[PDB]
Symmetry: D3
Subunit: 323 residues, 6 copies
Amino acid sequence: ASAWPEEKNYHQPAILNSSALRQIAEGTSISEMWQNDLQPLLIERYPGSPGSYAARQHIMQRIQRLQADWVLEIDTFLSQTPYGYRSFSNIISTLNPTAKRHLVLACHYDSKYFSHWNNRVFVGATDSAVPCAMMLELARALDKKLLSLKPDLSLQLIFFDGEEAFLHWSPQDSLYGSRHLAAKMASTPHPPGARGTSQLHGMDLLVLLDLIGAPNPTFPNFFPNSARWFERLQAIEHELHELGLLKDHSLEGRYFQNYSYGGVIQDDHIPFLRRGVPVLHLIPSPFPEVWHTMDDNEENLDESTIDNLNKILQVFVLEYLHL
Amino acid sequence: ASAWPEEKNYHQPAILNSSALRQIAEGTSISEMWQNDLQPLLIERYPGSPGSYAARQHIMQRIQRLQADWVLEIDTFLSQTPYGYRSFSNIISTLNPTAKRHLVLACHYDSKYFSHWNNRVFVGATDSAVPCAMMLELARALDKKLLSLKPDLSLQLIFFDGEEAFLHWSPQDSLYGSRHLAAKMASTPHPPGARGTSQLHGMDLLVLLDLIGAPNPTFPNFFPNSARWFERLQAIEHELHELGLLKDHSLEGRYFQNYSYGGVIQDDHIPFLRRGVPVLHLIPSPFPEVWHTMDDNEENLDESTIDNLNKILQVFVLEYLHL
Amino acid sequence: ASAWPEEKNYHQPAILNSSALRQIAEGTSISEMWQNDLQPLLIERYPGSPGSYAARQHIMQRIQRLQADWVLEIDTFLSQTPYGYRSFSNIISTLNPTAKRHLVLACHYDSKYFSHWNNRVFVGATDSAVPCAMMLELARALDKKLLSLKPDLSLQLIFFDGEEAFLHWSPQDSLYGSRHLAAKMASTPHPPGARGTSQLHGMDLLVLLDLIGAPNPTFPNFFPNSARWFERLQAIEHELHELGLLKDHSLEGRYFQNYSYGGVIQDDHIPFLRRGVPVLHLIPSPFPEVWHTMDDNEENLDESTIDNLNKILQVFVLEYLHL
Amino acid sequence: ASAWPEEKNYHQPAILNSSALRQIAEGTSISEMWQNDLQPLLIERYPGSPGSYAARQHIMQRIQRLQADWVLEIDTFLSQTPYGYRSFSNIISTLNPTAKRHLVLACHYDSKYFSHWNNRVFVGATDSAVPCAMMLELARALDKKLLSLKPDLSLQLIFFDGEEAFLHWSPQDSLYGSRHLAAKMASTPHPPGARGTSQLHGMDLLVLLDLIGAPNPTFPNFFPNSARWFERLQAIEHELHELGLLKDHSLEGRYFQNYSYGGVIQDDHIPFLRRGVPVLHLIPSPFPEVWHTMDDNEENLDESTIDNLNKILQVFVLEYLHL
Amino acid sequence: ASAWPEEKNYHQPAILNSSALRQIAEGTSISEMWQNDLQPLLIERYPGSPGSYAARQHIMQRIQRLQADWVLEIDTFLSQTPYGYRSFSNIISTLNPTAKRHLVLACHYDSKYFSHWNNRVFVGATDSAVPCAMMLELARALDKKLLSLKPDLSLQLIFFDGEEAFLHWSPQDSLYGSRHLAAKMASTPHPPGARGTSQLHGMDLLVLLDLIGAPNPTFPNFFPNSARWFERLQAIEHELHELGLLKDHSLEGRYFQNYSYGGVIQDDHIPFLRRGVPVLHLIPSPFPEVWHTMDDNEENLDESTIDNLNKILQVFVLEYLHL
Amino acid sequence: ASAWPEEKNYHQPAILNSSALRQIAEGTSISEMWQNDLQPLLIERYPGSPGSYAARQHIMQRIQRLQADWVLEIDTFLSQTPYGYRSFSNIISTLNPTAKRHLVLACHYDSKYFSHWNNRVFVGATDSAVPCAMMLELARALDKKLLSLKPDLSLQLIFFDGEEAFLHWSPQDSLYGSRHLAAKMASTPHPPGARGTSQLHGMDLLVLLDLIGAPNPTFPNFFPNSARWFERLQAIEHELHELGLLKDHSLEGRYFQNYSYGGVIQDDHIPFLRRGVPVLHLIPSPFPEVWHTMDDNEENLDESTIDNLNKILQVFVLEYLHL
Ligand SMILES: O=S(=O)(Cc1ccccc1)Nc1ccc2nc[nH]c2c1
Ligand SMILES: O=S(=O)(Cc1ccccc1)Nc1ccc2nc[nH]c2c1
Ligand SMILES: O=S(=O)(Cc1ccccc1)Nc1ccc2nc[nH]c2c1
Ligand SMILES: O=S(=O)(Cc1ccccc1)Nc1ccc2nc[nH]c2c1
Ligand SMILES: O=S(=O)(Cc1ccccc1)Nc1ccc2nc[nH]c2c1
Ligand SMILES: [Zn+2]
Ligand SMILES: [Zn+2]
Ligand SMILES: [Zn+2]
Ligand SMILES: [Zn+2]
Ligand SMILES: [Zn+2]
Ligand SMILES: [Zn+2]
């Protein structure tokens, strides 16, 4: 079958000048995210709960209200769990469904199931509601350049349901949404009418955000096949510093360090990885000090870190997509 | 209900009187089937071939033109074969997609891949071009009563792609279409919005027709869980003989002869049966004398047996559906 | 390289004469069974229910009132199901637990979980309340002969929990207690202190009673490796018939006619067969006409068919042990 | 062009006249097989035993003394068992190795592991010393016709090691030589230098003799894709009886009653069957009375049944190969 | 609720002052341990051997003399190996067996099977005779406080058999006792009478000691969900040293160096990890220099290193359990 | 089963004195390797191409022209791929084929399948043409010592076919040759006549060379059970620097630094690892900058870096082999 699944190994970015970096900082507003994107997600939203549904509708509405021509799919499936059968729904948002190639941004939108311990509620502020909102604030900041789309390439956003275990982390109790999605795409022909290629082959790179929002994260190099693109993240971070385009930020503790981790952490990327999709995994090591506590809330977030990461990220999408 | 997947076990048919049987004998014509439903499907149509596309467009068009509100689904997927990657397309036809339960009729519409041996072209007339044409005819002859649907139970037809092996019969080279749809159905919630039940649960019974069109066929009783529904066929056959609505037919050359065998044959029922679906398997034993030869063609069919079979089956479906 | 797990292949019976065939027929009370062993078990007793614990107490108490030295064990375990984790309990009854070899009688004591269709309650009278009671009637009727055991050979009874599916028959929704117990016997040293042999290797023959109680049952002959013990049953039947020790019985309608089936019927035997245990499987084909309906009750049972099989089976066992 | 694995679907015999049949008939010697081929095999020969090396040597020595250009090969491998790691050797003997297609005849040559019960030694006369002898007498009796082989087709012979279990029949304790050899042939290119076909595709048909030599055998017809070759066997037995070329033989106790089956019997054909090879399985139902007893010895063989079957089979083979 | 398995996620220690830390230090003797707990283990004890029954008897006796209320269970099973079927026996010693939650400490008590290279005998002093004596020394020194137990939480000890490969490390040749025991616990309702939780859910934290006793060991921090418990270890090691309670101890060569390691090391925790149990894995990297040689003996042990570790570990256990 | 598989764990090196360590430096020619061994291999040689047959023939011809007497075998096999069934051929070179034990050197010889991007052809200079030529220079630069073999230890070379994925990396699409050859060795008794041991038991240490040729490579230490042999590399390296036998080499730019990675990195060692062969894996992290681009050519290799590696690797082998 034709060889376009080769193209990703050759793709190169389109680097921005100093005047165009400045524009991007001005383009992005954390407090608008904080109020209109982030806060309506800080709620109990484990799979099947009335919060899951509220959260899915809020995410849909914030996207529909943009100009860029986004196509939305709800992917609804039944799976077995320790508490029996349950239904889940991944949310998928695509620009130019027909293009063979897509850069993919992903996170998970469910929150881990718990009882109401010490009369509190778990709402996973780093895990992973901030990541969702940064995705929502990216589509809005760049809705202008993203509309200039009506190398055959576009953009895609995935919001997984069921990342967390219900009872005890095992292969059969975790990653419900990503295991189903990776298989579905492996067996769907792409582009439409193709005879020998699939939607997976169409994934250019998968950028997974997990556990973002705490102060002083450090993100390692996990994989040697995406090393060259993690390196671009460094150089983007370092240049926006010397232009003092970031806040409360220092070059002595940079977010993207130069030390490969070696092993891997279990997460939504795994069913994609083992079928040959390239992955850039933006999960910090160590895990926030609040990980899986009633104190992963709005109060412990750190407004400045998030605002820096929104900026670097927004540039990487823009240079990858030659926009 | 929670609940309702229980009902198929207690369903009981609405047996028809002598006046009505006569009505339906008169209501179907085998000569119409032959010219407009069968002969267009006597063609080379192995997966991915031009005739596969043409077999599909015909089957669609014959249905698109009836009264009853049939909903057509095209299930197009990518699998691996001994020759590499290939695309298949199953055809599904449904009255009242929302009903919890559907009685299901099915066959395979691919022909088997062969070189052109002796300058002849294999076209599978019993295997399975007739079967498609009997299902096509049936929906035409009862379009009348089937439209009355506008015991929460309606009717579905399935036309599989890729039942035959490409090179050598094995678990990875066979039943490409049935193995896809079973998995898709078992992981889809039914009825829309359900939490603990699936489309697979909604399959009241599966009647798979295969290898049909030769004279003096004999079909054994394959499974002890659908046994009673096969006794029905025996008694529908024995009441059209005595009424004189069958042709060139005797009660010593009967088609359904309470026998056993008593083991199992591999076919499109296998991936449904191993997840708990009840099966009525309408495949003869022995196979037709012409099985898999260049002489399994139009000339070797028997007009009479196919007309008889049509009559019995059109009965069964009306008595099953209480119409 | 030991040794004894082969003794079971050379084993021969020690046949009874006419006067012992008459004594055996007069020592068993079809009336005593029906009231003291069977009727207490015709209730709703699906896994986890109040009825399950009541059936376990009835079975244990009836066995304890006997003089023979029966040793009883409760094998309680945890398993996943379509509705979640749940607890199950098999019942094991063994004479001479230390012996190397044991003949095994077995059936399942649960009832299938149904809703109350037409304000009725499923109780599974042939499925399998009667085989439970036949097992209790054999232990009573022969109590005098069996307390003589104090070849290294003896007798065991097993009553499985969780034989039926909870929702839809699959490999993961069926045969809960037999899949569990087989894995546990395969991994247990037998006899005590042994270095290279297991309890599973000590099962001489597994005689599984299922779906018994209706009149005119035809029991097929399933496996080549256990054929000669089926042939014992035929001759036993025939020579009791021909001393007038049977009732409402004709040689023209025997229970054990020879008739090879060839394939399998899913059941509690499957996890032991798969490991090389020889199986004598007493399940008729076709299934009782009342199978998985609310008329599987006391009023459709056949007193005399049952009484006849209690006699055949007691003769079989006494020959198997030389008693 | 390759492609050529379909040519076994279209192959047809060359039937021999009444004069060629008296020719074959007078051509075999049942006492010279008995003397020189069978008797040296009636010894203990479980795998790794000295009888195993002695048996392997007599088989090869007897083949090597014929004129036909027989190529001998020894397939020695290691494998894990209930008593630990052990070494086995299959014997493969082939005419025209370069030919794309071969008709295959086979049995197993090991005898089952037992201890000396009652001071006797198990030799498996029917199981399977006689089939071994039949294969050798066939290759001598037809030596001058096969020497003519110099349709691209010829003849292969196979003797398997490690068929029987050591301790308890299971997927890992049984069929050691056949499970090895099937996976080897499926991963060897054939013919030499071929790019997309394998030695397994060149097996035209697998003819597996097992448990033969007892009087009055009844052989089923197990598979639909070889039923036309069961037929030919049925017809060869009929013609030979009507020319009075059989002995002590009755058309009422004919070996090939057409009644069928049913399901399956595990044997050396299963690793090949499961991958698409057609099989004519000449195991009888039921098994001899002496099956797996110390009485499966020379005395209980029936000379006349074997002689008759020798003749039938050599006529089957000559007609398969057009000689 | 039925939700208690979430409790261990919220558990916090009760941190001891400096005069309680001084009592702990004074409360443990390395020479009593050396003479009465360690030395009798420095023998040959691979599975099945006389030294294995002797180490079992010594472990049980030394616990049976303490005042605390330990319940001892011997878990004995069969398994297949490169040499055939063999019997194994784990050792489980439990306080308050009815309590829902248990902090678990563990090592393997077998020794690796070797020939006597150079007329010397392999006794695995670090591998793992020392870890066993550390566990016995801790039960003795904390005996009076462990007596308080009579937060539903107590203490359990596990000695695994069959950790080493007999022949070549493979999924089937290694971790014989721990794979058996994790599967057993996973299917055992806990607490007694429970309906949807297991003994495996009861394990609060699995602290696994292995390859201990050589000088200057570096333990990494392998897992993100047990990392807050690794930090407790470092804090304990820092305080004891600045109070002057360590020996021959440098804060430039502290045992717990917050350096992380992504590559898993296979060991007895793996069957628990993959079912969701949190692990604090105390194995050093690199392995000791003497690893799997005849020089892993008593003279190459370092007295001071082991005495420091006893003290760090008993402080852990008291702060975990609030004594 | 004998004990000799233990011998590898005790084996120790026989180190060289400053003066033999110059004889090595001086007996290897980077310029002869570059022209006579490398350049012939810098062509398109993906599996089945004309370039693959020619690279077999180069490799063999170079080895056949040397005094030591190497035994060559060509291991051909058939496997399924994303484009269909294909033929592949490993190259295996052994001294003393019958010795119990062998040290093993290896790489892959196939070149990744790519379309001709920008009119350029992928030839994989580091991936892995240079590892091939390195293995060719070593046998030549040492031909004279290795002829003293005619401690049951010798040397083996292995050049795999089919390492790269044809389309997308996955367990079914990568490592065709290694997966195939580890299974064949595990099922081959070694030495000849052996009853309990395999060819795979004989592999002392597997040293896999991959992705070599770039400047300034950093090779990590992957596995605790092969660490002692990496320390030998690190030490060999440092004394060659001190003696001045190294070019363009510093100590801050050490090839073998103290660096512990997580592990894997999929490659040809995986299928051996899962069966317990110990592995020395000489692949760097990060991968070279040119990896899987058209600039992985002759111009971007570094002569010094490769010359220095030839010197280390050659010492290591003579020290390992006591030559
Ligand atoms: O800790 S994990 O490796 C899962 C695991 C695997 C094995 C044993 C115990 C736990 N990964 C993980 C867990 C929770 C998360 N929440 C957000 N991202 C998460 C990622
Ligand atoms: O028919 S079965 O093969 C179950 C089955 C198999 C395949 C598909 C769907 C259902 N065996 C069965 C069913 C009910 C029973 N009650 C007592 N013994 C029973 C045995
Ligand atoms: O009976 S079998 O199906 C194997 C089996 C299957 C399941 C359980 C126990 C045994 N076939 C078999 C057994 C022994 C033979 N000896 C010569 N040919 C033989 C064929
Ligand atoms: O990157 S790898 O871990 C394989 C992989 C795994 C998952 C996804 C994509 C690719 N190993 C690898 C790749 C290329 C090589 N070329 C020479 N040796 C190589 C080894
Ligand atoms: O080295 S391991 O990772 C196992 C292994 C994995 C792959 C190949 C060969 C061996 N773990 C191991 C080995 C020996 C031990 N002795 C005590 N604990 C031990 C742990
Ligand atoms: Zn989380
Ligand atoms: Zn067909
Ligand atoms: Zn039932
Ligand atoms: Zn046998
Ligand atoms: Zn060890
Ligand atoms: Zn590569």
